[PDB]
PDB file of C-alpha atoms in Angstrom:
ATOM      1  CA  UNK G   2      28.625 162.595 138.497  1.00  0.00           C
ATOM      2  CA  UNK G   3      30.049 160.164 140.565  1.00  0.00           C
ATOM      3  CA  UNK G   4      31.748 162.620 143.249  1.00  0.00           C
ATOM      4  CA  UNK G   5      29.032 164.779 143.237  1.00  0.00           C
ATOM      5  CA  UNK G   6      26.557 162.113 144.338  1.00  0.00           C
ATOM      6  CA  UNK G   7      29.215 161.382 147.426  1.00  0.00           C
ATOM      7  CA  UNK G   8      28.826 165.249 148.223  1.00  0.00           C
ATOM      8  CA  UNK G   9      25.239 165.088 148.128  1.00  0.00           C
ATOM      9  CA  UNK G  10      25.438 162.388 150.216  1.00  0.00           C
ATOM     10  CA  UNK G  11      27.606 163.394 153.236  1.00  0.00           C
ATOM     11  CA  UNK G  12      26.637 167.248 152.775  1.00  0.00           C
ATOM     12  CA  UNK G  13      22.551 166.138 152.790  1.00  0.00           C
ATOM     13  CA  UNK G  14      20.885 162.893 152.436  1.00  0.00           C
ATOM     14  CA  UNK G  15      22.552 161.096 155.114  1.00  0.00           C
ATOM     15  CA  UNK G  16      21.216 163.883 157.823  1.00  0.00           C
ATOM     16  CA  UNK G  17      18.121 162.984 159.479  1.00  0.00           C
ATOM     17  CA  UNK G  18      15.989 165.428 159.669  1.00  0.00           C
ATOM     18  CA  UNK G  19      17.098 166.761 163.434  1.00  0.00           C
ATOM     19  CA  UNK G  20      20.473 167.121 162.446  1.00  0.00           C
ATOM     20  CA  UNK G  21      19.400 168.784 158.767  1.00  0.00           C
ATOM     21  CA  UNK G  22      18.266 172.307 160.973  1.00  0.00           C
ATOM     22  CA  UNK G  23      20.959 171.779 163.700  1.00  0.00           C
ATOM     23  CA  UNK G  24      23.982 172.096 160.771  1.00  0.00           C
ATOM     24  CA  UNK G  25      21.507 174.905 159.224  1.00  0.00           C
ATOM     25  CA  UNK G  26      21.617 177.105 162.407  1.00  0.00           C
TER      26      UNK G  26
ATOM     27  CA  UNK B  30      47.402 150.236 166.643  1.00  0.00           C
ATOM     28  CA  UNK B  31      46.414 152.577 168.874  1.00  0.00           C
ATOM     29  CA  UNK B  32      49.841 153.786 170.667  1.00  0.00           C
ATOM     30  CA  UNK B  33      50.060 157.377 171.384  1.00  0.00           C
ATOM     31  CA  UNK B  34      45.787 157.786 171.417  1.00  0.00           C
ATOM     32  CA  UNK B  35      44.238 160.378 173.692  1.00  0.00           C
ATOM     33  CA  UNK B  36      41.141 159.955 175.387  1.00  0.00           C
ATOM     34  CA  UNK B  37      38.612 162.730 174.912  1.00  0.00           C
ATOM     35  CA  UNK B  38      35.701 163.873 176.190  1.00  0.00           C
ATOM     36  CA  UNK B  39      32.937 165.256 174.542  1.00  0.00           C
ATOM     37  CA  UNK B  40      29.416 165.359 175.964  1.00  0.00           C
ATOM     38  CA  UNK B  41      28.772 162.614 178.084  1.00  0.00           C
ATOM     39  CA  UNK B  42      31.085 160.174 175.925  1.00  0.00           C
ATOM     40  CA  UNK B  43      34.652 159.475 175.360  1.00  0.00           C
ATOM     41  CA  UNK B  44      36.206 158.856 172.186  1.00  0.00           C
ATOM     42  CA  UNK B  45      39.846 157.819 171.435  1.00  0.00           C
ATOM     43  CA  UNK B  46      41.470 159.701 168.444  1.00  0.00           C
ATOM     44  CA  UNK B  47      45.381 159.495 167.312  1.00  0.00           C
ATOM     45  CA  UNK B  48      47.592 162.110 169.228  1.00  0.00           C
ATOM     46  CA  UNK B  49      48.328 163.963 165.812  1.00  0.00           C
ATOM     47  CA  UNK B  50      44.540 164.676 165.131  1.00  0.00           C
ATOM     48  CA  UNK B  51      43.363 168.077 164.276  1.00  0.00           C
ATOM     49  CA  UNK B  52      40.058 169.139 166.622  1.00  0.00           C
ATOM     50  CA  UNK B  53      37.388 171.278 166.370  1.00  0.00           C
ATOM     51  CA  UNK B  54      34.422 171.394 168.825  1.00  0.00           C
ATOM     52  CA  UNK B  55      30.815 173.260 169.099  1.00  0.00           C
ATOM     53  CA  UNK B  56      28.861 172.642 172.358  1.00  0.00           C
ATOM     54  CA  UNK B  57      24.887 173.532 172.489  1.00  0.00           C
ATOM     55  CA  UNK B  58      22.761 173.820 175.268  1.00  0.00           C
ATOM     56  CA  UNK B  59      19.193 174.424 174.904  1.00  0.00           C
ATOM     57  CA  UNK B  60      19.555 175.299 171.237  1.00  0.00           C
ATOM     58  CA  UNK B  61      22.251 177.993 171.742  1.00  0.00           C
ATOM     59  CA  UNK B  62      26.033 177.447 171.578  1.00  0.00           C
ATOM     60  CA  UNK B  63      27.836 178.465 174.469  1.00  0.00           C
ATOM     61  CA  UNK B  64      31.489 179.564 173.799  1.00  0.00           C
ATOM     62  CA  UNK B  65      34.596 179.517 175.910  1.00  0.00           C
ATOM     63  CA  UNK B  66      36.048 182.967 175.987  1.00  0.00           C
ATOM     64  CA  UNK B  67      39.493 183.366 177.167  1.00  0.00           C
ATOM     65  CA  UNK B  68      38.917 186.761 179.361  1.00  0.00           C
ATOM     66  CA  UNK B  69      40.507 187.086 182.395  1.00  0.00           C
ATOM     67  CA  UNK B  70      38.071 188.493 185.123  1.00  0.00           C
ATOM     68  CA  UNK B  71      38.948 192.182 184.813  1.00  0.00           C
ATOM     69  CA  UNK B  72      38.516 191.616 180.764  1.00  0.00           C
ATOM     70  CA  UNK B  73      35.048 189.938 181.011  1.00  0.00           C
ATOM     71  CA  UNK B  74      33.917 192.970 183.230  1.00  0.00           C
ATOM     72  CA  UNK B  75      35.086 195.452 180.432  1.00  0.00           C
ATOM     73  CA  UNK B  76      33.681 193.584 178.055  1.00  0.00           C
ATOM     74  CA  UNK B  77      30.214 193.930 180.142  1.00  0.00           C
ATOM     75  CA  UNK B  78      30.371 197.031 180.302  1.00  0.00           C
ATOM     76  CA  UNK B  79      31.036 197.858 176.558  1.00  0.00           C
ATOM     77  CA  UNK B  80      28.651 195.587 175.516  1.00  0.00           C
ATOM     78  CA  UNK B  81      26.264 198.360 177.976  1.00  0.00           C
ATOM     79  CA  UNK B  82      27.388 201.074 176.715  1.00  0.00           C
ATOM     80  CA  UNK B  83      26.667 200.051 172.881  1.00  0.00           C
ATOM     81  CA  UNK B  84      22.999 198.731 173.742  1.00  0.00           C
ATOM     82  CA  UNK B  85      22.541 202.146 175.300  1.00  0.00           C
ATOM     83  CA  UNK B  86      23.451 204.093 172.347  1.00  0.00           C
ATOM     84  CA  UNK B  95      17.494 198.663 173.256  1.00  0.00           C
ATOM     85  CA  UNK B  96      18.649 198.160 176.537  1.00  0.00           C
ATOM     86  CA  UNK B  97      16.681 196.825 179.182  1.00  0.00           C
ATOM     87  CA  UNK B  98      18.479 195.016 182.471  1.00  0.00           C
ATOM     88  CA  UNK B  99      21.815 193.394 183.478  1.00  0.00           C
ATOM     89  CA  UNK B 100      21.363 190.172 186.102  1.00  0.00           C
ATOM     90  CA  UNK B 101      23.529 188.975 188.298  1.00  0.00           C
ATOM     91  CA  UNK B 102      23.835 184.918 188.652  1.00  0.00           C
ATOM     92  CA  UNK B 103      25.701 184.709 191.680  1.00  0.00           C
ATOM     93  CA  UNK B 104      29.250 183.290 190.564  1.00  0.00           C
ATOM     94  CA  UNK B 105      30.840 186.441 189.055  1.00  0.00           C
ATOM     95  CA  UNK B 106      27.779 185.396 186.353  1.00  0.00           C
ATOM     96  CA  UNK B 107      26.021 188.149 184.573  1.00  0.00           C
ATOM     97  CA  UNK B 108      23.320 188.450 181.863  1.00  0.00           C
ATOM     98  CA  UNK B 109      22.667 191.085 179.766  1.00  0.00           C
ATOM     99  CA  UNK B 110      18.480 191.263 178.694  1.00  0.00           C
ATOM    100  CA  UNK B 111      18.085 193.760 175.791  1.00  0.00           C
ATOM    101  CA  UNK B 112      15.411 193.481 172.606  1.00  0.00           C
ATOM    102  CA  UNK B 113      16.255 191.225 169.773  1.00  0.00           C
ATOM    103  CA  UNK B 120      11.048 188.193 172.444  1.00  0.00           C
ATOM    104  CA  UNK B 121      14.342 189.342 174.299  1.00  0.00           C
ATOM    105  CA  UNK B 122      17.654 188.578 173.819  1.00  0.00           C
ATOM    106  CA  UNK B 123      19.468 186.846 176.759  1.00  0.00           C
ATOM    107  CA  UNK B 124      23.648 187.249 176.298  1.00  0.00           C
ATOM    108  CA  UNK B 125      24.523 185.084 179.379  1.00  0.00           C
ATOM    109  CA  UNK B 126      28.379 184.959 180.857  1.00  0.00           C
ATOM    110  CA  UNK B 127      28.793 182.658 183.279  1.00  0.00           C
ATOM    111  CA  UNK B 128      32.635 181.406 184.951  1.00  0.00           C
ATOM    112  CA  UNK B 129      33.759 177.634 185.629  1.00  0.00           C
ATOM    113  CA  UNK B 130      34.755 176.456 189.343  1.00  0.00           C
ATOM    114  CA  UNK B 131      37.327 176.104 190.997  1.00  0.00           C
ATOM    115  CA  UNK B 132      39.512 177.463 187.459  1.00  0.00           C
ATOM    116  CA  UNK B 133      38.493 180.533 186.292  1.00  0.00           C
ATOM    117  CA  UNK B 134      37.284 180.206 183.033  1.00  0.00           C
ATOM    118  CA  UNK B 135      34.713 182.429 180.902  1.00  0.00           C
ATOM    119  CA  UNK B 136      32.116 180.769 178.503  1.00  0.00           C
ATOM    120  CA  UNK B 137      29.130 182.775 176.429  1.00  0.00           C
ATOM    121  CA  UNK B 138      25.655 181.926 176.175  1.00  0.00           C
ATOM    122  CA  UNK B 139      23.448 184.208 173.930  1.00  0.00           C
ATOM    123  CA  UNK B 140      20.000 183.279 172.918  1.00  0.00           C
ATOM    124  CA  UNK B 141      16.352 184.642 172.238  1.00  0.00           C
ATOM    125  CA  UNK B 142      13.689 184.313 174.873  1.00  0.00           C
ATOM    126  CA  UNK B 143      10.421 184.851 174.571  1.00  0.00           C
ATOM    127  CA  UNK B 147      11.875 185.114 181.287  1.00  0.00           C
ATOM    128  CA  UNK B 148      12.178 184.109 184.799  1.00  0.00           C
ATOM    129  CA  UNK B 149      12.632 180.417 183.139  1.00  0.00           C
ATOM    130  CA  UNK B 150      15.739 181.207 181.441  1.00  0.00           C
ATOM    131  CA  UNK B 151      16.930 183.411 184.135  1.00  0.00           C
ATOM    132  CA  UNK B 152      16.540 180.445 186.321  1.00  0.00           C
ATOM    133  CA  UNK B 153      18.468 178.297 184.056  1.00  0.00           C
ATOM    134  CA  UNK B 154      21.210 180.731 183.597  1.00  0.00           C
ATOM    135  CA  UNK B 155      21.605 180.526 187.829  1.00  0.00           C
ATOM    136  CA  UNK B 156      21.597 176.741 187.277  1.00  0.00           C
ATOM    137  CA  UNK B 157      23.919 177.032 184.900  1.00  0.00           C
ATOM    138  CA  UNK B 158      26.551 179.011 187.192  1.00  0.00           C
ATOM    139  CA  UNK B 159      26.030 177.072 189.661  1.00  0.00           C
ATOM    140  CA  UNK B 160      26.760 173.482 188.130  1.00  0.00           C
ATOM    141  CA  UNK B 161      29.894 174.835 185.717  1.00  0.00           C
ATOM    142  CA  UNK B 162      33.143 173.274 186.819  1.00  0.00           C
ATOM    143  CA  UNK B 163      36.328 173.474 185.407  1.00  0.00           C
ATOM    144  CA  UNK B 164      38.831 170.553 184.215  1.00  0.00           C
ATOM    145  CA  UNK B 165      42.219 170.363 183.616  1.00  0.00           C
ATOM    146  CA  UNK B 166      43.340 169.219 180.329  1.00  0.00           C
ATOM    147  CA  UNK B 167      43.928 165.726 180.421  1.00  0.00           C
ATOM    148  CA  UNK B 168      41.228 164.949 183.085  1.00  0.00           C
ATOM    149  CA  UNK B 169      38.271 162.937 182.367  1.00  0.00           C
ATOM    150  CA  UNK B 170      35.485 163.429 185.307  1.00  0.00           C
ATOM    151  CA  UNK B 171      34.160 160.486 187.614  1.00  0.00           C
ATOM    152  CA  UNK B 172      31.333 162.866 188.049  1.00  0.00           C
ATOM    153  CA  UNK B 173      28.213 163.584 186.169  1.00  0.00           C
ATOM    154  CA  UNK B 174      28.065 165.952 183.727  1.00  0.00           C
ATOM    155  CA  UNK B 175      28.483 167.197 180.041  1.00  0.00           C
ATOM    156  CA  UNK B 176      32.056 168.215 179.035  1.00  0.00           C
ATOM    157  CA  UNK B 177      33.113 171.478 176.942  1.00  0.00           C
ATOM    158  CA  UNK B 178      36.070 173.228 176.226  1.00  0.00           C
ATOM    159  CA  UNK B 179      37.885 172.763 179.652  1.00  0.00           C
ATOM    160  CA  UNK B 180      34.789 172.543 181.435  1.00  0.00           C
ATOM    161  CA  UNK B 181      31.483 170.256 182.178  1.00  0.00           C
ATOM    162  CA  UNK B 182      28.079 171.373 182.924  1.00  0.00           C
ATOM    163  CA  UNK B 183      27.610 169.299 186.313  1.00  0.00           C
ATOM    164  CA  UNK B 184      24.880 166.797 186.974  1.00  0.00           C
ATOM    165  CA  UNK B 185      22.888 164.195 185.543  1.00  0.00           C
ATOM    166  CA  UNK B 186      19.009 165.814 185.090  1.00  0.00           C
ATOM    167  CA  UNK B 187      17.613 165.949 181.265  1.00  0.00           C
ATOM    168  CA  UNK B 188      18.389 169.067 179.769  1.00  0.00           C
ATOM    169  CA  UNK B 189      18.673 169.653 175.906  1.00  0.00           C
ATOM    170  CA  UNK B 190      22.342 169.332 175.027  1.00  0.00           C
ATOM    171  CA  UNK B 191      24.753 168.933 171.747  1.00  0.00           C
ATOM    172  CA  UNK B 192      27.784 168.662 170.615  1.00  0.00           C
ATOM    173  CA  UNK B 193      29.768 168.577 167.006  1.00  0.00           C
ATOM    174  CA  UNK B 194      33.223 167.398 166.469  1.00  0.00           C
ATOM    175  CA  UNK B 195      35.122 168.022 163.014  1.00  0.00           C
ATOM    176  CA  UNK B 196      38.814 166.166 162.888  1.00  0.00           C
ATOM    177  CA  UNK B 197      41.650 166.045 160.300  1.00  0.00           C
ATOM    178  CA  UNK B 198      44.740 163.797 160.260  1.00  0.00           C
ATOM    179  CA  UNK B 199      47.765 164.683 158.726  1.00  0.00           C
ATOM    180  CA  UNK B 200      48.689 161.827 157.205  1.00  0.00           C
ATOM    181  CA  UNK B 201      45.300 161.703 155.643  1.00  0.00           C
ATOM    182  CA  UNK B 202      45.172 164.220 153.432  1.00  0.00           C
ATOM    183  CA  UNK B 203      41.424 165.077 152.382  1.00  0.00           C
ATOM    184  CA  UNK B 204      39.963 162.743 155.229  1.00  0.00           C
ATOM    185  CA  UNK B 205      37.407 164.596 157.734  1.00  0.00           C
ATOM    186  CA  UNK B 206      35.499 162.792 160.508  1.00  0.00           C
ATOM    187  CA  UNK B 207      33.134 164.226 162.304  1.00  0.00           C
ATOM    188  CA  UNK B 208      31.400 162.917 165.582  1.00  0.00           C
ATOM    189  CA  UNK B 209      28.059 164.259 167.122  1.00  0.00           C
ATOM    190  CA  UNK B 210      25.594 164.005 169.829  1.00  0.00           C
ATOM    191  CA  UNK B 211      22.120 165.909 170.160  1.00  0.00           C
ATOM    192  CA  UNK B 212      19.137 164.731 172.485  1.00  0.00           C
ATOM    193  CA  UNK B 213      15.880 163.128 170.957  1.00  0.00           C
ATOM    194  CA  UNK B 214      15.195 160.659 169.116  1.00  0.00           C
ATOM    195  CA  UNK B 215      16.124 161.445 165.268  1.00  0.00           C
ATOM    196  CA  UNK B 216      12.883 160.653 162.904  1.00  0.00           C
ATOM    197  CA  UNK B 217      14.449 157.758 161.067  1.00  0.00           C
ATOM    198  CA  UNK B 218      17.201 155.319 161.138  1.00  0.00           C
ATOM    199  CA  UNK B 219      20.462 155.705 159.148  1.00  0.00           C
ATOM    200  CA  UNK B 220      19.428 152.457 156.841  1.00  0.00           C
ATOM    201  CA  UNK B 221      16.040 153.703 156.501  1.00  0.00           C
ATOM    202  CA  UNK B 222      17.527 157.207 155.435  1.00  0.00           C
ATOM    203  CA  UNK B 223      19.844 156.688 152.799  1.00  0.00           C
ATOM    204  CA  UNK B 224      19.391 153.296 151.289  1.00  0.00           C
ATOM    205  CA  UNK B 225      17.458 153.943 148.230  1.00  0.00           C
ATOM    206  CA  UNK B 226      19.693 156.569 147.395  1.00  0.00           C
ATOM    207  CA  UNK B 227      22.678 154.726 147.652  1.00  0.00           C
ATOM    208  CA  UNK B 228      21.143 152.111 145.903  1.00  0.00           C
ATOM    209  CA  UNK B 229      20.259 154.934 143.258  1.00  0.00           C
ATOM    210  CA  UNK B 230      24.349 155.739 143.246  1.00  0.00           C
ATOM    211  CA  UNK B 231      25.377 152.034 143.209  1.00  0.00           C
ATOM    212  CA  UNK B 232      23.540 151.226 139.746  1.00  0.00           C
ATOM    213  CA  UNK B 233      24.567 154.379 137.841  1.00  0.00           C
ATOM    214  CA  UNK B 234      28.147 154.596 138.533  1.00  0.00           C
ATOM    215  CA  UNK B 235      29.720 151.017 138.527  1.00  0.00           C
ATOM    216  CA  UNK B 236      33.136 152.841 140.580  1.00  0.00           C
ATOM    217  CA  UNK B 237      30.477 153.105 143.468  1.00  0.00           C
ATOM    218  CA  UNK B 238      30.118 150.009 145.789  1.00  0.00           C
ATOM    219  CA  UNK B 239      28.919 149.425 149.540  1.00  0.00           C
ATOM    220  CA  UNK B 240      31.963 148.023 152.005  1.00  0.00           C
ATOM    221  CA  UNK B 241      29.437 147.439 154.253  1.00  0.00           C
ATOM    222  CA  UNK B 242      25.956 147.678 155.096  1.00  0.00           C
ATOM    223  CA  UNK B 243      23.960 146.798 158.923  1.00  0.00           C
ATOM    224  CA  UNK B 244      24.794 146.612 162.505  1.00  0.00           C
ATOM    225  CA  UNK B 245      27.877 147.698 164.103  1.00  0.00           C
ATOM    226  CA  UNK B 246      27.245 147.934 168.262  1.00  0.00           C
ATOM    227  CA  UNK B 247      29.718 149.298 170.323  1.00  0.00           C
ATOM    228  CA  UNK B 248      28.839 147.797 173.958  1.00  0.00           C
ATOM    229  CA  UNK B 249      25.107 149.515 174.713  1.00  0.00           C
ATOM    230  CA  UNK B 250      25.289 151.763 171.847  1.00  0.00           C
ATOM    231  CA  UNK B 251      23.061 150.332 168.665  1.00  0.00           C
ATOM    232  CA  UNK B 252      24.562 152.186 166.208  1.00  0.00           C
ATOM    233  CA  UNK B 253      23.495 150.908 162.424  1.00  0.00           C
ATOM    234  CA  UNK B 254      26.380 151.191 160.022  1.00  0.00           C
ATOM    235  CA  UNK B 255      26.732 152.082 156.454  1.00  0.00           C
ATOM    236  CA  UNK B 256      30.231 152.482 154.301  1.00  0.00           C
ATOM    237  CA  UNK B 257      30.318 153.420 150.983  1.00  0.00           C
ATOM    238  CA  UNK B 258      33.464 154.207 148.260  1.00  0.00           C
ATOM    239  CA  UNK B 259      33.670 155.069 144.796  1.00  0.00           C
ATOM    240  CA  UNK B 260      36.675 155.579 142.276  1.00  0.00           C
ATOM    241  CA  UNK B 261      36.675 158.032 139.840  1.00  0.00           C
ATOM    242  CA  UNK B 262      38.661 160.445 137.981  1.00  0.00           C
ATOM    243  CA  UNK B 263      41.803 158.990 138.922  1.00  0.00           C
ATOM    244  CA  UNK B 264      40.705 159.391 142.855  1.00  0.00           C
ATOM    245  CA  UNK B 265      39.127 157.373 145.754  1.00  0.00           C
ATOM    246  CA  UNK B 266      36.219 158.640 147.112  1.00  0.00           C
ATOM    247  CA  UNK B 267      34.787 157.376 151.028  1.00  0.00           C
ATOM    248  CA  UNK B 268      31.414 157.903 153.394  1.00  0.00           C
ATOM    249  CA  UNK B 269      31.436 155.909 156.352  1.00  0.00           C
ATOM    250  CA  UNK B 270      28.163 156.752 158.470  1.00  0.00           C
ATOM    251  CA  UNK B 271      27.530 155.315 161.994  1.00  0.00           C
ATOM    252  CA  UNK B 272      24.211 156.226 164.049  1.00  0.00           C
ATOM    253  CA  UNK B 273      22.687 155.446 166.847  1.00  0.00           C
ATOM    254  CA  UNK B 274      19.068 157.004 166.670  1.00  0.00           C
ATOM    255  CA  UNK B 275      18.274 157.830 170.203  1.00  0.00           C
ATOM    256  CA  UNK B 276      15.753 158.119 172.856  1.00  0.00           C
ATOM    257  CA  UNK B 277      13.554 160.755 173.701  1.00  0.00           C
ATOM    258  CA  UNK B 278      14.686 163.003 177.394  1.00  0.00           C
ATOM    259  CA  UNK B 279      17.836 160.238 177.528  1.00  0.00           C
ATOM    260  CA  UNK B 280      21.342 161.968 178.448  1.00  0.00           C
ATOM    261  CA  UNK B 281      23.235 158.192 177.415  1.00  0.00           C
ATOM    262  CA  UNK B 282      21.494 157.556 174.774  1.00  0.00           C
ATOM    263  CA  UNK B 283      20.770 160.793 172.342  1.00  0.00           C
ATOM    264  CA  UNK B 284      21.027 160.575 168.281  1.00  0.00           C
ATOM    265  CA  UNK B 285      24.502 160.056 167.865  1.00  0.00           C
ATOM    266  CA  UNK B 286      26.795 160.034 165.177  1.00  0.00           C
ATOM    267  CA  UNK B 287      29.999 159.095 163.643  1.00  0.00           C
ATOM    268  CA  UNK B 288      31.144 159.753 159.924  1.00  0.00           C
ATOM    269  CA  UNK B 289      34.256 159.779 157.998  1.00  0.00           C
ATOM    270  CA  UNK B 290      34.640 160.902 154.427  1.00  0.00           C
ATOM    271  CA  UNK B 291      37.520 161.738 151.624  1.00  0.00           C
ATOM    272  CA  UNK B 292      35.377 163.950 148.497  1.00  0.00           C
ATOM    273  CA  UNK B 293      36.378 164.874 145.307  1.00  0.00           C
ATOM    274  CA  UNK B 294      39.905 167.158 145.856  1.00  0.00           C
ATOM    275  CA  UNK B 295      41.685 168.963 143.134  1.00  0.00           C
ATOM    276  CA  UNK B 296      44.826 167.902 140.990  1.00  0.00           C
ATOM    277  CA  UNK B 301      45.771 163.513 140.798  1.00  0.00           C
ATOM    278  CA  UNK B 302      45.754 164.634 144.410  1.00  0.00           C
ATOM    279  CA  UNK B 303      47.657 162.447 146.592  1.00  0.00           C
ATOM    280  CA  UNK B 304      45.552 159.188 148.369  1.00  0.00           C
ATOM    281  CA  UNK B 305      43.627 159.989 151.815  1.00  0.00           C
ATOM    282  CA  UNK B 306      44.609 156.219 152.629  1.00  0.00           C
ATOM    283  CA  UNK B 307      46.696 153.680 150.939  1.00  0.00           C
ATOM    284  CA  UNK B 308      43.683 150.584 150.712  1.00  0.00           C
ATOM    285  CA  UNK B 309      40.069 150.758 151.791  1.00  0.00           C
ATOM    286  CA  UNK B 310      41.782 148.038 154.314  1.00  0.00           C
ATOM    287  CA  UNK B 311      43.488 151.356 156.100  1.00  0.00           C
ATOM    288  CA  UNK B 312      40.363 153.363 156.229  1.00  0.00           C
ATOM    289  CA  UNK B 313      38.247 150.588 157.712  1.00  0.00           C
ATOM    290  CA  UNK B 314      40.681 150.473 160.420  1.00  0.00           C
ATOM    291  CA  UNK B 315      41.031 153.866 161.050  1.00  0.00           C
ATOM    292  CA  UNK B 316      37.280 153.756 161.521  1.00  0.00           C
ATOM    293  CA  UNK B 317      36.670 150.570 163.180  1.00  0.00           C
ATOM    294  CA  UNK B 318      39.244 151.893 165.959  1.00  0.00           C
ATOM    295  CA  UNK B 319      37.637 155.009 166.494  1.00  0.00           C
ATOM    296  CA  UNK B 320      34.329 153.913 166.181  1.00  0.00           C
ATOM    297  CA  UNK B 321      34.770 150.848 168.699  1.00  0.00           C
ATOM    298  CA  UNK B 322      36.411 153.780 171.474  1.00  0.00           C
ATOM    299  CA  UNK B 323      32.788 155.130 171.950  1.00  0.00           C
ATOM    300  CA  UNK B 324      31.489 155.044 174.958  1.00  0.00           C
ATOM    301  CA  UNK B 325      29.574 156.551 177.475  1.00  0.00           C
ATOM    302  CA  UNK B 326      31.668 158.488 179.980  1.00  0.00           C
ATOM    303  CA  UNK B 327      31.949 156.234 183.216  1.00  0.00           C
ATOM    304  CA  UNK B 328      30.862 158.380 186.101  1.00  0.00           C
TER     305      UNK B 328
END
């Protein structure tokens, strides 16, 4: 699904790893 | 376009934003977020001594930083609930966070010492990272972040966000997400790239990538701008810019009226970044 790939997108794979456990805290 | 645009401060950088934007702001320093309270001084000191009384009924020692500043050290490693005032305004800001002692006590005293106030629209000439009416004075490496979420109103699902954090991020932005977007762009033929590389904004090497899709009956954006940062640098930490309209619920009404729009509304904010002049 076409949205739900832009979600994953901005909500995931576009966070390096730093800022993956900075949003997480 | 940019009449009416305020001049912010986050961090060590400014960014220019339209004067109708929505703002919300989370500051970090070493790890833990540190909070503006809006206690007046009599108010902080009950709050103190609540907070005391409740640990009591655990408890171990309440410090004094010098500048009306007090800690409270209890059990969670301890836990470290710092309160510490800006100078010359008065103006109350939390700092709670687990330690494992005279080194964060020490940094606390630091801390009240080099917290001055600012007035609303004032952007310092001196060193220093700026909060919620306030910057941490000086210009030695400490471990600092910020996050920035903003809404327009006449943008209707639109968010950008805008973010600093010190060290050097693993990988680049193009390095992170191109195979996936590549992945996106040849299963779902709404999906292309506006535009893929390079976009500097004076010093700051920021790589660029801007995707949008269309798709039941809506138009879909993720513009991502990082710079990937230096390790111990205060100027140059990972930072990053991003705007995106996601899937909203019924056909909802457009975030922008032509991909043309949203480039510009990103281009302009993305070109205002800068290091704050000090």
């Amino acid at each position: 699904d076409l949205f739900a790939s832009i979600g994953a997108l901005w909500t995931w794979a576009w966070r390096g790893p730093k800022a993956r456990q900075e949003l997480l805290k | 376009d940019k009449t009416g645009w305020i001049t912010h401060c986050f961090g060590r950088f400014l960014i220019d934003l339209p004067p109708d934007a929505v703002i919300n702001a989370g500051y970090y320093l070493w790890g833990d977020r540190i909070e503006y309270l809006d206690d007046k001084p009599t108010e902080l000191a009950a709050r103190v001594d609540r907070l005391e009384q409740e640990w009591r009924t655990m408890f171990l020692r309440k410090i004094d930083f010098g500048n009306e500043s007090v800690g409270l050290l209890s059990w969670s490693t301890y836990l470290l609930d710092t309160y510490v005032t800006s100078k010359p305004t008065w103006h109350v800001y939390r700092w709670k966070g687990k330690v494992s002692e005279q080194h964060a006590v020490e940094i606390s005293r630091a801390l009240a010492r080099n917290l001055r106030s600012r007035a609303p629209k004032e952007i310092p000439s001196e060193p220093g990272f700026c909060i919620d009416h306030a910057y941490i004075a000086g210009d030695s490496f400490q471990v600092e972040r910020f996050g920035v979420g903003v809404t327009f109103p006449e943008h209707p699902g639109a968010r950008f966000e805008f973010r600093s954090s010190t060290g050097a991020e693993l990988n680049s932005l193009l390095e992170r997400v191109d195979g996936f977007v590549q992945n996106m762009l040849s299963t779902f033929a709404g999906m292309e790239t506006l535009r893929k590389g390079k976009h500097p904004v004076g010093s700051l090497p920021g790589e660029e990538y801007l995707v949008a899709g269309s798709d039941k009956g809506q138009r879909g954006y993720t513009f991502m701008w990082e710079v990937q940062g230096k390790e111990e640098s205060l100027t140059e930490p990972n930072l990053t810019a991003g705007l995106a309209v996601l899937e909203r619920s019924n056909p909802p009404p457009p975030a922008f009226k032509s991909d043309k729009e949203a480039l510009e509304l990103w281009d302009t904010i993305v070109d205002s970044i800068r290091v704050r002049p000090t």
